[PDB]
RNA sequence: AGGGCUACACACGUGCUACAAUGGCGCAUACAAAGAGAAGCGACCUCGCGAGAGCAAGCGGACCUCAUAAAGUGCGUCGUAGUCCGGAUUGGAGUCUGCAACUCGACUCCAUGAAGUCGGAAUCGCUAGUAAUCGUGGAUCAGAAUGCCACGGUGAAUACGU
């Protein structure tokens with residue numbers, strides 16, 4: 003392909019709360035810190051909560067009422 | 069705000085209806101009225117049709133959609149401009 | 151002055167020229183001036199560099215100009231993003247805290263243009 | 265792209281059995297992916313197309329090709345040769361890499377993701393979908409963004425039936441709700 | 442005479458006095474430090490909202506006895522300013538008379 | 543059952559606050575009046591900056607609670623600055639009530655604290671304890687007032703005249 007017009011396609015890291023770290027090339031540049039992936043995803047599971055996927059459980063145990 | 073010593077507020081019908089759903093489906097909402105009930109992190113992933121005075125406006129429960137009231141997401145007056 | 155990346159004034163009571171931090175009124179000003187152990191009515195130009203560094207590393211226990219600014223920004227950001235009513239008041243740049251709206255709120259709305 | 269390797273090895277291995285193909289060249293291949301963004305309203309502003317262009321440029325590591333309206337039309341008050349689109353052609357490893365990127369980052373990132381469709385296959389195992397919002401890609405800022413513009417996609421394969429593209433994509437564990 | 446509003450008030454007061462001393466202690470369960478906020482007083486709240494919100498003593502407007510008026514009420518006499526002024530003029534209120542100083 | 547009466551391009555009307563050194567803050571310090579008080583006041587006590595919470599005596603009251611009056615006085619501080627004036631707004635975190643505080647409660651703490659430099663044309667009130675100001679209490683009231691009513695506290699000018 004051409005040069006100097008195509009965006010930069012470095013390989014960055016997709017490290018999700020899923021805990022999976024994948025090396026994709028993209029136009030991101032920085033190390034990417036995620037929340038959900040092809041794994042730890044609802045549709046890719048049947049578990050409610052497919053991963054902590056957000057610690058608002060903390061506030062929910064900050065107010066404890068159950 | 070609500071007193072901590074007092075806790076959260078949520079209708080029992082809402083909780084139990086919510087429970088039967090987390091028992092027995094994921095695919096459809098509930099048609100509620102309790103704009104004053106709170107959103108439990110356990111209701112996440114649902115898209116309940118909450119009343120607003122005349123209409124059951126639906127609200128998809130997400131992580132951040134936890135610490136407010138059902139009435140917070142069913143506006144009541146329709147302003148457009150003058 | 152250059153503490154916390156800002157340039158708090160000089161020839162000013164220490165509690166007061168401490169109020170210049172975006173996040174310190176007088177209360178937190180006094181709080182810091184005590185937690186570091188410096189007199190209040192000592193002007194800023196009346197302060198040494200040991201106490202300054204003490205202040206540097208004492209104010210640090212708060213959120214600061216850029217950090218706090220950004221912080222509140224992200225808070226309102228979650229407001230807007232979450233899709234709530236307060237988010238809508240904020241979106242409009244209106245009273246968010248429950249004021250009357252048909253006449254007042256020349257603070258959020260701005261003066262009576264139309 | 266690992267997906268490419270995975271294809272070449274495991275998906276290849278699977279499909280030769282799955283279709284009983286006697287020649288690997290008879291076996292389907294993903295040949296290209298085209299991301300078209302029918303901006304359309306670029307008749308209004310250039311920068312939105314530019315923003316869309318920046319968007320389609322940022323999302324995939326390949327400068328875009330700005331499409332133009334074929335003819336002028338009154339139904340959209342578009343004049344002929346006017347840039348009412350922007351698209352990119354991903355093929356090869358970039359295609360595969362963006363593929364892995366896609367199916368493993370942005371597909372979760374779907375709002376109320378209920379599964380991806382299994383029928384928007386144009387008849388020859390060439391799939392076609394619609395994206396409503398770009399923010400699913402973390403290549404987006406979501407704060408320094410200008411719109412929620414989507415685009416449409418035509419993943420043109422060498423599979424020849426819609427079902428074959430379906431099976432092929434299933435080999436990639438496509439959602440297929 | 443709007444006997445609908447007055448039947449609502451009487452019905453509301455009747456059930457608040459029926460289930461009285463119940464939401465009282467159901468509240469006593471909740472302003473006290475025990476019950477772990479989740480074991481007794483929490484289940485207690487459930488029981489609260491099972492209990493008719495229409496048995497609370499705050500839903501009442503404290504309406505005038507003769508007219509059932511929402512406004513201008515006065516906890517001393519139980520009647521509006523109007524009905525009470527007419528009685529005051531007529532002398533049926535012992536001792537009451539227009540003040541002047 | 544919910545929502546509205548609380549919507550908000552806007553205009554107006556009342557009312558509140560301020561724009562400052564005759565003052566702001568801090569400190570200390572006294573002088574009221576009146577009323578209310580029992581599904582209430584609630585001393586104290588204890589916790590909690592605090593919202594308040596627990597504890598809780600007494601009080602149906604010339605006796606117990608609101609309940610310190612504030613303004614003042616003196617100390618210092620601020621030093622005329624959008625300021626140590628302001629304190630809008632907004633964020634967060636609370637306290638409180640209620641079935642419940644999103645619409646649509648109040649308060650508390652922290653934190654930015656906006657306009658705002660005394661105000662067009664015009665225009666209002668008032669002749670003495672009045673104006674002016676200080677504060678107080680009460681009603682309604684689950685909770686809810688800058689409004690209402692009432693109390694005291696400082697306390698002046700000019701009315702030639704038509």
Ligand SMILES: [Zn+2]
Pocket residue numbers: 018019020021022036037038039040041042043
């Ligand atoms: Zn993940």
